[PDB]
Homo-oligomer: A and B are copies of this chain.
């Protein structure tokens, strides 16, 4: 109470803001035709690096900042339920940013939304302003971006099922420019979805395959991992969704073996490999963070690689060698 040597109308700067977030139970109810879920999930931490215009942290705006739900990155918990249904319609959708940082911090954090599910980046701070659905604040403050929800059922689907403009509501994205190099705030999402048409459960595994020589890569299932380097010397996959996985990787080298590592944040808990001839196989129980890499290095004449990833817990350990 009571602030020194001040006239009213003054605005007084504190040194830091604490906002307190508590756990939130989900609400289900059936609107006669639809099941309706309200819940709050954790999107991602929002970081910036110094002297960079850092868009979506590292990453950049791709196809798993697409709203559909069914999207492990945006809706970790909801994915499981949504797999049991054929189509969805968002009622309310809000992204909320809770500062991680004190008010001497400085810089800008901004949240944006665009209806073009596969809208490219805002290229710089000036472009970033042109969005219709934008929130720009100091990193030490709190804010929230409300996404306009339309009134049309679209299919619940992984981003590898025809035109993303048909299945996804839009795209979420953030930017941090100026400012320090740090983790600036939490990004939560509050939502209310209606799910329609119960069906037999969609699979929640990932199947990412490349050839070599044809140069195309094909993905089915959820985008847990992404393929970043082709090569015949190296194979690197990148974690898009933090968590523990049991990944199975099979490929065609010409003899030699492989050298696995986790560049970035992550640990390998249980390796097993068998590599020879023109066939190699590596199955592992990894825990990994967003934008970390699982690299298979020291390869020699490697074409044709396929990855199978499923969510597990650390204790689903590989036991042979």
Contact = CB atoms under 8 A, between A and B. Distances in A.
B3 A8 contact: no
Contacts of A134: 21-23, 40
Q: How many copies altogether? A: 6
**Chain A, interface size: which category?**
35 or more
A198 interface: yes
Nearest to A316: B207
Chain A interface, DSSP helix/strand/loop, else mixed: loop
B102 A207 contact: no
- Shortest Cβ-Cβ A-B pairs, 3 listed: A23-B134, A5-B141, A12-B14
A234 interface: no
Contacts of A250: 272, 274, 281, 283, 318, 320
A141 to B, nearest CB: 3
Interface in A268-282: 272-276, 278-281
15 contacts: A6-B17, A15-B103, A19-B137, A25-B132, A32-B38, A40-B134, A80-B80, A98-B136, A126-B289, A127-B200, A148-B197, A207-B312, A248-B308, A250-B281, A304-B321
A135 interface: yes
Contacts of A140: 5, 13, 16, 18, 102-103, 138
Which of A16, A81, A204 has the largest number of chain B CB atoms within 10 A?
A16
B102 A143 contact: no
A296 interface: no
B313 A120 contact: yes
